[PDB]
């Protein structure tokens, strides 16, 4: 009848002295051993409710969507976003921006499938030209995923050799890392105090403004060349709404929503799928038998010449299982994205008051040992039955659930499929590190789980 139980806080420090030095997620998993799946932690000055396991998270996000569909802040980026753009919006702003983004994410995508297929052929050409050299593949995994969203948002794609484009990708990469660092986790507890000192929050803010400066320019160039009878892309479509609603001072189709919604789509469109690819190829280097078996399946179902297509998925249970398992193992957003309850809500006999922040600990569903035997190991059979047919599970929720479920889920799974199969169709992988010596420990583990840097060669078949 009050908040969920948890560790007794100290004034100012909240539960700091009970935390694990290894980070937030490790701290919360230690609290779960003691308190169970629903508990409260005081992150510096404020209580945050944690929900763990797929039952509690689905009860909240699906069964109680009228209460658990608010968005909380991520302290390291709130000073930049300030509640603008679909990711960080609440209330009617969110409603408008969410419907807008979904409709225009769709109806310019001509089809998404064709754009990913074309990007995948550019990528295969780029990898051929690299002549089996060693590379850290981060920049190309970023380029290809960024380019899909660029084609919908900006109506164009950028060349892999373009230093400017590269410069923006570097900023997405550094920024997601700094958000996820130990400092970024400490900022989440003590931003009230730490914001007054130098630190990585200032670097994040600067990177995000540098990306936003490009968006603002591109908006300006679109404004100048706009033809209301044929919008080219999502920016044109938003500009036409802004024109329709111009006599309303309170229209949500504002310039700040335009720039930060666009940045939002971009950043999420790029860095999420790119990081999942980076983990996926590291996992292929450590488990080359899995890569060999996917390749077998591509030979038998697709053959060595015809481009993979989405229709191939249903015939390729092994490859779909491997990608599910990459997503489950790589656990991109272990604590998901913060929510907030929008009205006083009862939950499992507790009372969670309006405006309390809620974290859905997606990582606990992804590693549920009732749904996945050996959840700490990479094993595609987590997603196969005895017959080797695909076995989907309701514990697989790396995109979350309910009203704020990832709006990019379809696009992301299309990209993973098409890029992973197209690459393995044309190339096998090698590197200087023996599989037994490859260390999968993430380089950062905070809001994001971010794999270590590594070198790889793509060898033409
Ligand atoms: C592996 C790829 C991806 C994963 C694992 C992922 C995961 C997620 C998760 C866990 C959330 C939070 C949902 C919540 O608040 O409970 C989210 C939100 C979001 N993602 Fe994705 N994402 C991926 C790719 C993408 C792509 C490719 C796009 C854009 C095309 C995208 C756009 C968004 C947006 C706009 C939101 C905010 C939704 C809202 O607040 O209404 N994501 N994502
Ligand atoms: O907008 C004020 C700033 O703009 C000038 O910047 C240009 C550069 O001269 C110009 O070379 C540059 O090119 C970026 C092209 C690639 C865009 C990549 C996109 C990928 C997806 C997400 C958004 C960016 O972007 C900047 C913004 O227009 C300068 O960079 C800076 O002085 C100044 O801070
Ligand atoms: C802000 C982000 C780090 C970016 C990728 C995940 C996220 C939490 C939403 C968009």
From Swiss-Prot:
GO annotation terms (biological process): epoxygenase P450 pathway; ketone metabolic process; steroid metabolic process; xenobiotic catabolic process; xenobiotic metabolic process
What does the UniProt entry list as the effect of changing residue 457 to C? In allele CYP2B6*5 and allele CYP2B6*7
Please indicate which superkingdom the organism of origin belongs to: Eukaryota
Q: Looking at the keywords, is Cell membrane present?
A: no
Keyword Metal-binding on this protein?
Answer: yes
The reaction(s) catalysed by this protein are:
N-(5Z,8Z,11Z,14Z-eicosatetraenoyl)-ethanolamine + reduced [NADPH--hemoprotein reductase] + O2 = N-(14,15-epoxy-5Z,8Z,11Z-eicosatrienoyl)-ethanolamine + oxidized [NADPH--hemoprotein reductase] + H2O + H(+); N-(5Z,8Z,11Z,14Z-eicosatetraenoyl)-ethanolamine + reduced [NADPH--hemoprotein reductase] + O2 = N-(11,12-epoxy-5Z,8Z,14Z-eicosatrienoyl)-ethanolamine + oxidized [NADPH--hemoprotein reductase] + H2O + H(+); N-(5Z,8Z,11Z,14Z-eicosatetraenoyl)-ethanolamine + reduced [NADPH--hemoprotein reductase] + O2 = N-(8,9-epoxy-5Z,11Z,14Z-eicosatrienoyl)-ethanolamine + oxidized [NADPH--hemoprotein reductase] + H2O + H(+); testosterone + reduced [NADPH--hemoprotein reductase] + O2 = 16alpha,17beta-dihydroxyandrost-4-en-3-one + oxidized [NADPH--hemoprotein reductase] + H2O + H(+)
Q: In which tissues is it expressed?
A: Expressed in liver, lung and heart right ventricle.
Q: Name one GO cellular component term.
A: cytoplasm
Listed Pfam families? p450
Disulfide cysteine pairs (residue numbers): none
Summarize the impact of residue 361 to N.
Answer: In allele CYP2B6*15
Membrane topology label: Peripheral membrane protein
Its function, per the record, reads: A cytochrome P450 monooxygenase involved in the metabolism of endocannabinoids and steroids. Mechanistically, uses molecular oxygen inserting one oxygen atom into a substrate, and reducing the second into a water molecule, with two electrons provided by NADPH via cytochrome P450 reductase (NADPH--hemoprotein reductase). Catalyzes the epoxidation of double bonds of arachidonoylethanolamide (anandamide) to 8,9-, 11,12-, and 14,15-epoxyeicosatrienoic acid ethanolamides (EpETrE-EAs), potentially modulating endocannabinoid system signaling. Allele 2B6*9: Has low affinity for anandamide and can only produce 11,12 EpETrE-EAs.
Q: Which family does it belong to?
A: Belongs to the cytochrome P450 family.
Name the record gives this protein: Cytochrome P450 2B6
Q: Which organism is it from?
A: Homo sapiens (Human)
